[PDB]
Amino acid sequence: MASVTDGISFNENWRFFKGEIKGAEAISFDDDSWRKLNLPHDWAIEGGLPFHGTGWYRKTFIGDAQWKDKIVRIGFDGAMSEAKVWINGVKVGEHPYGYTGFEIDITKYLKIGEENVLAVQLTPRDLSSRWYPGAGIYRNVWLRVDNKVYIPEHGVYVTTPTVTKSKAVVQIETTVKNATFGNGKFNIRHSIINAQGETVAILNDNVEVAAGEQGKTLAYINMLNPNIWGQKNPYMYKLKTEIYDGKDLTDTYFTDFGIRKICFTKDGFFLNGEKIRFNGVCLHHDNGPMGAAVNVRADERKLQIMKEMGVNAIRTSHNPPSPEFLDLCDRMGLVVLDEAFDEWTKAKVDNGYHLYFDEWSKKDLTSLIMRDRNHPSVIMWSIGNEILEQSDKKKGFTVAKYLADICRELDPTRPSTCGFNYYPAPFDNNMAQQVDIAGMNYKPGKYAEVQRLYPDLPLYGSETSSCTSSRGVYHLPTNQVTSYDLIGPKWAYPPDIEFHFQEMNPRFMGEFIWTGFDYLGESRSSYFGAVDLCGLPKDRFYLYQSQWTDKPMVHILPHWNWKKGMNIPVYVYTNCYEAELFLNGKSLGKRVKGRDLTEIMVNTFQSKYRLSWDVPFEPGELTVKAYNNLGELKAEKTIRTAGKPAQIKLIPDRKVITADGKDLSYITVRIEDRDGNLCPEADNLVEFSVEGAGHFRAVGNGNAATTESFIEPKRKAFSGMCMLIVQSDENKQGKMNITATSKGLKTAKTTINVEL
């Protein structure tokens, strides 16, 4: 029956056509020549890069007999953008904003036994995004077959209004729709299920709902010795909510949730009774070579890499993310600023959200909070970013309030926030006061002043640094940017400056850097990421890791393929007390952090966050030793001058992947000399073959200025490396054999095993 099922995938077996064709909405339209594919799908990754035009999707399906007299809905988590949707030729849906999901009820129009046709037209416009949006049904689609008494979309809201070590209270609001002709009282059974799948608590409730109406009800249950959700231990519970009409089960509905408390004052943010600080990153929703199509593993990898950098917090610049991304943040212990919009009523781009803000702002923000208010990862609702209303002196604040009031109406359990780039406008124009917590974009030099002027505002750096670099590229002394991390736009400054102004202003909750990963644009890709587009750390990663992690480390830059005669400035990043540099054995001296300052060129800053030597380049090896204040060795790294490119090495991040059709292995591709040393500048075209249990998916190298295809089985190295991405086939177990080939280098092989 429909009573057991929450919502099943409707991603399989679609037809796609890029371009305008008239009559594609209809039941009788020949689509035998249309490309066949499974969702999710981003046609713009080809398939900055062109993201506008027209796309059609079609799916044909028999009305299953089990759907007779059922409520049937198709849930779309995201469609980019300007979507129209038909069932059996009848237009039943229209949705402009690509980042909020929507439902279409096809019940009235569904034909049981005969064929049905679901058509979706997307008409994304040019100049509708300042970053790469992608284009298509880039997020999962769901079929929802329900009995006539059921829980509608986003119909369970779980809060924890007491959280203590001895006891937490889990409060649950349930919404029930009555689509029968009869008034009824319906029983509700909440089963709270732990990490091992065992039901540990059950809460009963009920609700009277009249015919054709919707009803809500609230109950709470005690959890003794709760497993607290926290950053080191991100324990998740699961809620099974069952609806009953007398003895008959009518519906089942699942909700993941965590048990943690949050709290803020003007002096900071609090998680489970302790000062928390945001070592944060802004990320855009694309996964580079993988595009904007939702891939769970792609996101998992990105968030793991960010955690290794010391990241504990995410700002979803500048839109809602996928549920999958937030589920990952939940399971990985990251706290999230969940951001709804980039512009309000005043336009930043000709075809941005301002075209829809008047008619859609309340719907879309409501939809966001309804979708995400159960995620324990989400700690703030951010209403906007760098909005032009900041400079409307008389009335800009009204729009901020309006969105802020909506947040408070729907979820007072999390504070509102907003990213402000003007200064002092939004603080002087009563705007910053309309949200619970104010975020400054790129104003470390003003942190002290704004606290003098507005001492009752809670504050954090909503968007910081904007330093640019290209991985493993140094200019001594262009088309790429120096990985010595000095250059950026006019408002930009190096990470050292944020660190300095964070330490001087402890009331600031933290920073969210622009950006954690590189992202796709409209040079088609960004330079702002601490990690590059394909997931390879730049030196900036290590700078951040030196500041944000306890596990001892040390990093040395630049590479050591230079010309004899040159003075190379050598930088070292470490969380240790001091470090010592060694060229071929010769000690080039100690250097203590917070004492032997490095002069960064912005006017120029004496930085305590870097250790520096001036080295005359003799080739061979350069080794750095990091020590604690007792002189004990705690970390070391060794770089050496590599010779001519001789051989390809392949390093999978994972040698076993799930046989689900979606999971990936990210194989780092290294261009090495005869003795195994990375050739730090190699750009050799590498070709790839994938045989057996899976296929070639994608490829990439973190170069922003290239024009190479992400989806052809060929890619050039950039600064010694590139990345090959491979994927399982659904239900196909066994070995998957990768061969990597390049003109004049030793061929490389590796096996990826595929299970489940």
Author numbering: 46 to 92, 104 to 533, 542 to 586, 607 to 686, 694 to 847
Pull verbatim passages from the article behind this deposition.
determined the three-dimensional structures of these four agarases. initiated by GH86 or GH16B, which generates NAOS. depolymerized by GH86, and systematically saccharified by the exo-acting GH117B and GH2C enzymes. exo-acting β-d-galactosidases, while GH117A and GH117B are α-1,3-L-neoagarooligosaccharide hydrolases.
replaced with W657 and C598 in GH2C, respectively.
